[PDB]
Design an enzyme around this catalytic site. Structure first.
Site, short mmCIF file in Angstrom:
data_model
loop_
_atom_site.label_atom_id
_atom_site.label_comp_id
_atom_site.label_asym_id
_atom_site.label_seq_id
_atom_site.Cartn_x
_atom_site.Cartn_y
_atom_site.Cartn_z
N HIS A 1 -22.79 29.20 -56.52
CA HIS A 1 -22.42 27.80 -56.34
C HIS A 1 -21.40 27.41 -57.41
O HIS A 1 -21.19 28.14 -58.39
CB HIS A 1 -23.68 26.90 -56.46
CG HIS A 1 -24.37 27.00 -57.79
ND1 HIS A 1 -24.10 26.14 -58.84
CD2 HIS A 1 -25.32 27.85 -58.25
CE1 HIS A 1 -24.86 26.44 -59.88
NE2 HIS A 1 -25.60 27.48 -59.55
N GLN B 1 -30.38 28.85 -64.61
CA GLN B 1 -30.55 30.18 -65.20
C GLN B 1 -29.20 30.86 -65.32
O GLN B 1 -28.34 30.66 -64.44
CB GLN B 1 -31.49 31.01 -64.28
CG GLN B 1 -31.95 32.34 -64.89
CD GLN B 1 -32.95 33.06 -63.98
OE1 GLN B 1 -33.18 32.66 -62.84
NE2 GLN B 1 -33.57 34.10 -64.50
N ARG C 1 -18.01 13.11 -62.20
CA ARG C 1 -17.79 11.67 -62.43
C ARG C 1 -16.35 11.32 -62.19
O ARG C 1 -15.42 12.05 -62.64
CB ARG C 1 -18.14 11.27 -63.88
CG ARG C 1 -19.54 11.64 -64.27
CD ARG C 1 -20.59 11.11 -63.27
NE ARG C 1 -21.94 11.26 -63.84
CZ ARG C 1 -23.02 10.71 -63.31
NH1 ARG C 1 -22.88 9.97 -62.20
NH2 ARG C 1 -24.24 10.85 -63.91
N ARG D 1 -29.54 2.86 -56.79
CA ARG D 1 -28.56 3.67 -57.54
C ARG D 1 -27.81 2.80 -58.53
O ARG D 1 -27.40 1.68 -58.21
CB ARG D 1 -27.53 4.29 -56.58
CG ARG D 1 -28.14 5.25 -55.52
CD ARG D 1 -28.49 6.64 -56.09
NE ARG D 1 -27.31 7.43 -56.42
CZ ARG D 1 -26.60 8.15 -55.53
NH1 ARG D 1 -26.94 8.16 -54.24
NH2 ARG D 1 -25.53 8.87 -55.94
N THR E 1 -16.81 3.83 -59.99
CA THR E 1 -17.66 4.76 -59.27
C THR E 1 -16.86 5.80 -58.50
O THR E 1 -15.63 5.75 -58.45
CB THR E 1 -18.70 4.02 -58.36
OG1 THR E 1 -19.68 4.98 -57.86
CG2 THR E 1 -17.99 3.32 -57.20
#
Ligand SMILES: [Fe+2]
Ligand SMILES: [K+]
Ligand SMILES: [K+]
Ligand SMILES: [K+]
EC number: 6.1.2.2
Length: 571
Positions: free
Chosen positions: A15, A140, A419, A450, A530
């Site tokens: 990923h 991990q 962000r 949120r 945002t």
């Protein structure tokens, strides 16, 4: 100059694919695969688009590179977990940088960098600090889930590690999955946690001590014989444990045909808000464990500067509580603390080995693609929409925000990390007591609970915030001062906490000018900032992406390059 291309992402079970290009220790380009492919999280792919962008941006080919660096020790993982590493360096390069996209005459040197070293490099070398304690808290790496290390004199020396079955990152993802938020959305769990109350922060699983934690739920040396990480073993253990000790069983996902949408859509059986006390308790457990680990490495190294990276370093609530600890004087967490940053970290580690000095990140994360006015105009002319080219776009955008309108802002080079930071943002009023509900419910159609956060000029932040420091990345919470405890309701919590971006004129002249203009209207050069997307897509990257999102959301205006588009309100 040395030119080093760092990479993350592989076609098997990976990923957060990304690529970063360092030229003489400076970041020439950096992109996440998801922003260019439009496929969230960059799964199961080499970072083909991101690396193609980096080379294009720099005017380079692979033959111009001094090295290619990959942010995991893949050969080690294949040898230990999959029965052997089958690829020559040339074969591995053909997978990472396929020849149809990356022609070359010869192979650049290929380096595999241990995953936690890459994380540590992405913090230390870009921090502007010459020494400090390093804390890596991850899901991990090849084996370990935590590394404590000492950064000094350009070197990183490991002091200790914690084995993967005790992962705090996996623990937090499993709780996020259990609540129905999803293991892929641990940031949502952190926001939910603010609404809950903690009962017993051990969860009947952790024991805390002055150096960190123990987990009595699973053998620390547990290993999945049938996988190459411990996620499934930890998932099984945590799900069983939580169902035993917590009043609600796992939330389940539901897949049903929705005739209003004409598709099968995924929902949850319960409202995840019902699990708010579990969210609060998990956040408290994570915090207590990490406080111990941080105190430990600072004490062992004799440092008072803390570098944090690894995916858990995106936990801004936790970071803000670390900053206020008596044991920490300075902290640096890069915007790319998660695995997207190990491309950059691997490149840095290799560039340092090749004798380069790495420049500080410097209060910006704006390293992705940008588009010229002609390129933006091409995308606009595709839609057929009418638009304007304001004489003073920044002043017009400030007036729109001051009036309570929501404005998409797509300017300059795309920021990297999760962000928005004034390059690909939705902007709204920080002063409005209705703006949070408006953007959560009307604009984004997401959860009412949120939170939002502000951007503000660095030149006023010593007056607004209780700490006089740069907060360039929205990665650390802090508190406002009394004079601003009630003036900024959409972006400051009831407890006065906030998660700010401070903006310098050098970091982002256009955004700085706009906030300046806004301050002249509303008193404080502060706005709500945002992500420019909604829950179903990565943050927009290109002008076409911005127009597609603008068109599907009830946003009032889009400032894209020098152009201003307003919703077509003629019947
Ligand atoms: Fe990682
Ligand atoms: K129970
Ligand atoms: K402190
Ligand atoms: K219009």
């Amino acid at each position: 100059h040395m030119r080093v291309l760092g990479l993350n992402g592989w076609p098997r079970d990976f990923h957060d694919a990304s690529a970063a290009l360092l030229v003489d220790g400076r970041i020439a380009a950096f992109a996440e695969e998801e922003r260019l492919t439009r496929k969230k999280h960059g799964y199961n792919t080499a970072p083909v688009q991101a690396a193609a962008f980096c080379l294009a941006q720099a005017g380079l080919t692979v033959d111009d590179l001094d090295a290619v660096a990959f942010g995991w020790d893949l050969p080690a993982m294949y040898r230990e977990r999959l029965g052997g590493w089958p690829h020559s360096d040339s074969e591995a390069l053909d997978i990472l940088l396929p020849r149809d996209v990356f022609p070359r005459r010869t192979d650049p040197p290929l380096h595999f960098v241990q995953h936690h070293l890459a994380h540590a490099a992405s913090a230390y070398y870009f921090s502007g600090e010459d020494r400090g304690a390093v804390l890596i808290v991850d899901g991990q790496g090849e084996e370990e889930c935590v590394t404590l290390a000492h950064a000094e004199g350009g070197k990183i020396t490991v002091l200790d590690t914690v084995p993967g079955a005790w992962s705090l990152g996996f623990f937090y993802e499993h709780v996020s999955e259990y609540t129905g938020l999803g293991g892929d959305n641990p940031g949502k769990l952190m926001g939910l946690a603010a609404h809950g109350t903690t009962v017993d922060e051990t969860l009947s699983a952790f024991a805390f001590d002055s150096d960190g934690y123990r987990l009595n739920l699973i053998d620390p040396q547990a290993r999945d014989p049938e996988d190459w990480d411990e996620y499934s073993v930890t998932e099984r253990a945590w799900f069983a444990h939580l169902e035993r000790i917590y009043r609600l069983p796992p939330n389940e996902f539901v897949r049903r045909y929705d005739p209003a949408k004409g598709r099968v859509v995924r929902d949850t059986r319960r409202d995840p808000y019902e699990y708010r006390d579990l969210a609060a308790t998990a956040q408290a457990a994570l915090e207590r464990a990490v406080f111990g680990l941080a105190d430990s490495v600072l004490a062992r190294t004799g440092e008072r500067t803390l570098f944090v990276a690894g995916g858990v370093g995106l936990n801004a609530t936790m970071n803000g509580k670390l900053l206020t600890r008596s044991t920490v004087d300075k902290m640096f967490v890069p915007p790319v603390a998660s695995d997207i940053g190990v491309s950059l970290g691997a490149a840095a580690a290799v560039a340092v080995e090749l004798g380069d000095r790495i420049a500080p990140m410097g209060d910006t994360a704006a390293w992705g693609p940008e588009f010229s006015p002609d390129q933006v105009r091409a995308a606009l002319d595709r839609t057929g929409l009418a638009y304007r080219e304001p004489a003073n776009l920044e002043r017009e955008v400030a007036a729109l925000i001051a009036s309570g309108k929501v404005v998409g802002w797509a300017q300059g080079r795309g920021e990297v990390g999760p962000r928005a930071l004034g390059q690909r943002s939705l902007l709204g009023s920080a002063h409005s007591p209705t703006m949070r509900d408006h953007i959560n419910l009307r604009v984004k159609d997401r959860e009412w609970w949120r939170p939002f956060a502000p951007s503000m000029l660095r030149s006023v932040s010593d007056q607004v915030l209780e700490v006089d420091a740069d907060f360039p990345y929205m990665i650390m919470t802090t508190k406002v001062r009394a004079a601003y405890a009630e003036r900024l309701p959409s972006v400051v919590h009831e407890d006065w906490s906030t998660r700010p971006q401070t903006v310098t004129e050098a970091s982002n002249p256009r955004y700085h000018r706009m906030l300046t203009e806004l301050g002249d209207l509303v008193g404080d050069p502060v706005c709500l900032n945002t992500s420019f997307n909604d829950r179903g897509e990565p943050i927009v990257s290109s002008p076409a992406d911005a127009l597609l999102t603008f068109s599907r959301l009830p946003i009032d205006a889009l400032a894209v390059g020098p152009y201003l588009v307003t919703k077509d309100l003629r019947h």
